[PDB]
Ligand binder design. Structure first.
Ligand SMILES: [Mg+2]
Lengths: 311, 302
């Protein structure tokens, strides 16, 4: 079981009700084939996205290296006009560039003022929103954000997770995506919503021994493919080609539970974040009992938590 | 996963304090001067000197209550303790136990000085700790083949075997996980051939092991689990003492068993943080519980 490699189930012809009432409550990743996405899927050539989306300047990642690394931040931020960015991500070599002729590009769309606006494709790319029919797989009152996702081929984003449920729509290009159950957290060596294990295919088990028990689900997304990701599910994407992605986040929970400053979808539901503050407190009172004693009692706690609150 | 506890002869008062004690590991100390006690505390001697003072007699045991509190006159207690004893409250092969406790059990600690003055004069506790850190002295009479369940104490302990053999096995505090701890007692009664059925984890527990001969002293650093099994009849005494600044402990504790106040409270607020988490759907609750124990492990462990 541990360290296994599963396929993410692929279903074609899934209905609204069957997704919403049968597949969704199942809380597992799943890919849907053949959904009517709108013509976006035959229109969004690079020439078109440049023309139609053009020149709305966006915040962008530039990396001189396929495997992007936040532990060493080996990439830099920059801005670019939408068309430019597109044209650049579809390239392999670059005449003009921010760091090297082979640097790779990564757009994760953001609301006009990232401080108070979630990203909304409808709001910020009105024409482009035109070509794409969001699958109606969730109550509208729970909509949260809609995000563009365009990357150079060979670009490896790192393993993270979000607090919202999420429909990732591969419109153009092939995407590889491996996923980890939320319960695989212990194995993932996380700093925040990120994992330190960059090379998942060929892991340095000297530094990340526990990564071994990690049971990975894998899937590759062709154009037209849609993938559902339950909240808290870890995921790692690699643009195998050039492609254009749109994701839709939405609330699985009462809007009341979420943190309102969070426009990205990382921040922990208030209850959890509060809990974490409480905990940091205990870790402090206990803290300056001698290490010997702290330790014994940290261990009691952990076992206790595992028993009252694990399921 | 089965070690011996080091035995050491000729360890100085100093050498121990300075270089051994701070190792925080269990040691048995051979050939300390305990006084005449080790010499004269015979069933017959004991019986005489002790007197007829009524004592709290308990009668392989189960903590499931397969024991029973009782009370007898000391001399008769020892005398039976050495016995199949004719007079019994439960059975002919009644097993007899004794763990000393001060006048008011809820108020005061046990203390050999206060409660066995004559007998006290026979034994010199080893000077391995300051008088200010003294916490209690206890008289331990048990009958042969009596199996007292596994527990830990919060005070450092000097178990002194004065008379008769006694086995004892121990476990790293950290082996808390494998012990299935119900408070300060562990669920696995028969330590030798454990029902791995009920408790699969007791296996992963490295168990240290020693045998006390009359005169031997076992140091048990606070937090070490130990299981004591009187092979022959005999009397032992143990002394608890505060390893931490006296304030750190629970005032209500007359046993040296209650958690340091810092622990007791931290676990209390912990129970709070669980009450908030609890209100999210189980699966979210779950995920963040795990993120909590990751956090505790990284920050507080070793
Ligand atoms: Mg994401």
């Amino acid at each position: 079981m541990a360290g296994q490699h599963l396929p993410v189930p692929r279903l074609e012809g899934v209905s609204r009700e069957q997704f919403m009432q049968h597949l969704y409550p199942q809380r597992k990743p799943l890919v849907l084939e053949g959904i009517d996405l709108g013509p976006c899927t035959s229109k969004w050539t690079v020439d078109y996205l440049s023309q139609v989306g053009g020149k709305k300047e966006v915040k962008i990642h530039v990396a001189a290296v396929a495997q992007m690394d936040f532990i060493s931040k080996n990439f830099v931020y920059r801005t670019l006009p939408f068309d430019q960015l597109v044209q650049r991500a579809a390239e392999e070599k670059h005449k003009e560039f921010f760091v090297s002729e082979d640097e790779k590009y990564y757009l994760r769309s953001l609301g006009e003022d990232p401080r108070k606006d979630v990203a909304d494709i409808r709001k910020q790319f009105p024409l482009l929103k035109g070509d794409i029919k969001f699958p109606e797989f969730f109550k509208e009152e729970q909509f949260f954000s809609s995000v563009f996702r365009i990357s150079s081929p060979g670009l490896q984003l790192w393993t993270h997770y979000d607090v919202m449920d999420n429909l990732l729509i591969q419109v153009t290009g092939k995407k590889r995506v491996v996923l980890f159950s939320p319960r695989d957290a212990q194995y993932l060596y996380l700093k925040g919503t990120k994992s330190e294990v960059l090379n998942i295919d060929n892991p340095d088990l000297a530094k990340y021994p526990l990564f071994s028990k990690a049971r990975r689900y894998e899937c590759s997304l062709e154009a037209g493919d849609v993938l559902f990701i339950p909240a808290l599910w870890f995921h790692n994407v690699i643009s195998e080609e050039f492609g254009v992605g749109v994701n839709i986040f939405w609330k699985h929970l009462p809007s009341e539970c979420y943190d309102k400053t969070d426009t990205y979808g990382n921040k922990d539901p208030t209850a959890a974040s509060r809990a974490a503050q409480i905990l940091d407190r205990a870790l402090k009172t206990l803290a300056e009992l001698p290490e010997e004693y702290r330790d014994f009692y940290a261990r009691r706690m952990v076992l206790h938590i595992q028993d009252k609150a694990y399921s």
